[PDB]
Write a protein that binds this ligand. Structure first.
Ligand SMILES: CS(=O)(=O)Nc1ccc(OCC(=O)CN2CCN(c3ccc(F)c(F)c3)CC2)cc1
Ligand SMILES: *[C@@H]1O[C@H](CO)[C@@H](O)[C@H](O)[C@H]1NC(C)=O
Ligand SMILES: *[C@@H]1O[C@H](CO)[C@@H](O)[C@H](O)[C@H]1NC(C)=O
Ligand SMILES: *[C@@H]1O[C@H](CO)[C@@H](O)[C@H](O)[C@H]1NC(C)=O
Ligand code: NA
Lengths: 359, 363
């Protein structure tokens, strides 16, 4: 007679479902479970947003889950899960979603994630501008949420060493950007930072080729999106970009996420007057009373010995101490030249070569 | 003329007959096309109830649009309907209750329109009041409830372009997604000096804020709170934590009654589809199923939106804002009196505030 406590998940595949059950199984062993004992409940992504929202109700909230884990769908979004769960104030944990929008508490009020948003790449840029004493940078940005996200996050780090001599924004969809790029040429700053989708970076990459702005002189510093798929195809040689380490290992993040959540469950039932979440959607319109506290507990969990590193959340419930590979395009091969360990840059013995040749 | 399906959803005990009787003008529809309305009743307003219901209706019948009314203080219904609207590409009009409560940032694909003031309309109104009674020093409290930045932005935008001399002391932001066992909302609230206080949040959030603001002496005399429509919500329900002398804007069921609203809902959907058949020789086909909106999506758009926003009927201007609000609604200022009753105290029309009192009597 321990109290059974359900944790839910919506995951890519059945293998991932089995990984999730196992992770919970092992949390029960690892932990002292006379009082409370977790139980895994799961489904995979439904084919559209409406069935997704009904499945959360039918399959998960009917089992009175205390929290819901959510992978990003393969080849559809976490949004209907955030929404449906958010209605009751059941916490949602994103395993693989990097879009910045989910850091907005007005939309996504019960959402944490074990991967950082894309906007947090600005931390790594900043630390590199210190390390490689780039004090004067031009900043090119897609006028969409994801682009503005990144701008704000850097400007915080600049605006209270380095400084941004201008910030240019373009309308996602534009292919002739030589209006914009001519504006970046006439400035004295040679370092260029881009936040753009895969297709928008493609557009930029060519327009900037055409103005010989890809040549020696110039440093190009970029994120993961802008060295993926077709952005990689037309990218200048010497570019520097990022790859979140394990950022797509759903299985790894299932592991760490279960670990954190089980910790936080056990810490929650140290407290008094803990109410159960609602059993099912139907006829249930009041929030879960304890959902906002459980959120607080999670939000200030620390797991230091995690498969993906050191688990902590910032105030938005985004992952902190995420690690990235620093990637340099040399002879149209993407080479790791360094890593961000979560706080420190660590150069490796592979030498960087910049646009031009640069020794 | 050919018949389009319209569903009318009513949540909570309903003058079902007075509504059926105010669409007595079935032969008031001389357009290209004629409504086939079908009243539905719902007992429940959770996400599942609403979705399965509207989706059943969609795969029983051929629904061109939905008119939704409820009796709840449940601003989430607005969000749920928006989502449904955008997923299924389907006009939903939220005419009353939760359905009409401000939903800031609807989808790009939404066909969801609400009867009610915009956030900005109400923020404006709130300044005309404070002008009138020459209240010029004031602070703002909000939560993260969507629209909070639109609110502070319309305020700030207005006061910093003003021959008048406004003096916004403080602007607060309260995080109610996290629990308050450390008294952080307390601390942030003590910080307040101002005589006036604009409060942007939900009715549920308000009750707690006020419970807190009370115990730190901010509901006393020489503090006036002003709140938007959605904090008053349903005026026949008045939480005890609400302080007396609270002021609110309101498009609750005052002059514009539910059956009127239903009738104009059906008007708007029918005339908008009329004008689109009349100018394109087709209207968009009701979606067989919402259990297949993934595939049938190149085949759909929210084309009908341009015709929904610009309607008149029996020569009344029923235009919608581009945010899917009502363009010019007659708002009613209201005051919580000493018997704990929302009493009218003002009427906003032809963009002109028209108060009852000259000075405020004391409750
Ligand atoms: C700091 S404060 O306490 O966070 N205030 C605050 C902030 C944001 C709030 O709502 C934001 C939302 O979008 C939440 N909603 C929940 C309901 N919703 C939804 C939509 C479609 C569904 F199908 C469904 F099931 C649920 C959509 C998302 C409400 C209150
Ligand atoms: C993903 O993570 C798991 C650790 O849980 C590991 O077994 C596997 O090697 C990883 N896969 C890749 C491609 O790194
Ligand atoms: C809604 O409640 C009414 C009144 O009791 C009832 O007649 C109707 O069958 C109910 N609908 C459902 C779906 O339970
Ligand atoms: C809206 O209505 C009237 C005529 O129907 C006209 O003044 C205006 O051009 C219309 N606007 C449109 C079609 O955008
Ligand atoms: Na979050």
């Amino acid at each position: 007679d321990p109290k059974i406590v359900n944790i839910g998940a919506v995951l890519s595949t059945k293998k991932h479902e089995q990984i999730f059950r196992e992770a919970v199984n092992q949390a029960n062993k690892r932990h002292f479970t006379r009082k409370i004992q977790l139980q895994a409940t799961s489904v995979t992504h439904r084919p559209n947003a409406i069935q997704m929202a009904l499945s959360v109700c039918e399959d998960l909230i009917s089992s009175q889950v205390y929290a819901i884990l959510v992978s990003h769908p393969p080849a559809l979004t976490p949004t209907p899960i955030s929404y449906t769960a958010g209605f009751y104030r059941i916490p949602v944990i994103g395993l693989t979603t990097r879009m910045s929008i989910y850091s907005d508490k007005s939309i996504h009020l019960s959402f944490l994630r074990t991967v950082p948003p894309y906007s947090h790449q600005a931390l790594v840029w900043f630390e590199m501008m210190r390390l490689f004493n780039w004090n004067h940078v031009i900043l090119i940005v897609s006028d969409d949420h994801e682009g503005r996200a990144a701008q704000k996050k850097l400007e915080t780090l600049l605006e209270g060493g380095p400084k941004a001599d201008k910030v240019l924004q373009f309308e996602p969809g534009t292919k002739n950007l030589t209006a914009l790029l001519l504006e970046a040429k006439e400035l004295e700053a040679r370092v260029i930072i881009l936040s753009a989708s895969e297709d928008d970076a493609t557009a930029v990459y060519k327009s900037a080729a055409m103005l010989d702005m890809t040549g020696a002189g110039y440093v190009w510093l970029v994120g993961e999106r802008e060295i993926s798929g077709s952005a990689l195809r037309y990218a200048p040689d010497g570019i520097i970009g990022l790859q979140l380490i394990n950022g797509k290992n759903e299985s790894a993040h299932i592991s760490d996420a279960v670990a954190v959540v089980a910790q936080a469950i056990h810490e929650l039932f140290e407290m008094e007057n803990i109410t159960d979440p609602p059993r099912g959607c139907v006829g249930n319109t009041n929030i879960w009373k304890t959902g906002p506290l459980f959120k607080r507990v999670l939000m200030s969990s620390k797991y230091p010995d995690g498969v993906t590193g050191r688990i902590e959340f910032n105030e938005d419930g985004d992952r902190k101490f995420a690690q990235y590979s620093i990637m340099n395009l040399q002879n149209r091969k993407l080479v790791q030249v360094g890593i961000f360990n979560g706080s420190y840059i660590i150069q490796n013995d592979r030498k960087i070569i910049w646009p031009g040749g640069e020794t | 003329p050919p018949s389009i399906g319209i569903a009318v959803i009513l949540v909570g005990t309903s003058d079902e007959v007075a509504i059926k009787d105010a669409h007595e003008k079935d032969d008031f529809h001389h357009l290209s096309v004629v409504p086939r309305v079908e009243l539905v009743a719902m007992n429940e307003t959770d996400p599942k109830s609403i979705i399965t219901r509207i989706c059943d209706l969609m795969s029983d019948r051929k629904i061109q649009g939905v008119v939704f009314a409820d009796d709840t203080d449940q601003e989430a219904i607005a969000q749920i309907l928006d989502f449904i609207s955008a997923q299924t590409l389907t006009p939903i009009l939220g005419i009353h209750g939760g359905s009409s409560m401000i939903m800031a940032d609807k989808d790009e694909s939404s066909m969801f329109f609400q009867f009610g003031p915009s956030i900005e309309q109400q923020a404006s109104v709130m300044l005309n009041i404070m002008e009138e009674y020459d209240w010029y020093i004031f602070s703002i409290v909000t939560t993260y409830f969507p629209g909070y930045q639109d609110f502070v932005n319309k305020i700030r935008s207005t006061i910093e372009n003003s021959f008048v001399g406004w003096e916004l002391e403080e602007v607060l932001l309260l995080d109610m997604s996290l629990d308050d066992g450390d008294s952080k909302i307390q601390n942030q609230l003590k910080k307040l000096q101002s005589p006036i206080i604009l409060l942007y949040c939900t009715k549920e959030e308000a009750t707690y804020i006020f419970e807190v603001a009370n115990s730190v002496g901010l509901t006393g005399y020489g503090y006036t709170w002003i709140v938007p429509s959605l904090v008053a919500g349903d005026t026949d329900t008045v939480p005890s934590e609400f302080p007396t002398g609270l002021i609110s804007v309101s498009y609750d069921e005052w002059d514009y009654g539910l059956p009127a609203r239903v009738r104009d809902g059906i008007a708007i959907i029918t005339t908008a589809a009329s004008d689109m058949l009349s100018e394109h020789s087709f209207i968009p086909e009701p979606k067989s199923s919402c259990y297949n909106t993934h595939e049938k999506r190149i085949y759909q758009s929210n084309m009908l939106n341009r015709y929904l926003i610009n309607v008149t009927f029996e020569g009344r201007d029923l235009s919608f804002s581009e945010d899917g609000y009502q363009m010019h609604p007659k708002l009613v200022i209201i005051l919580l009196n000493k018997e704990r009753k929302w009493e009218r105290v003002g009427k906003w029309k032809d963009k002109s505030l028209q108060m009852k009192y000259y000075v405020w009597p004391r409750m």
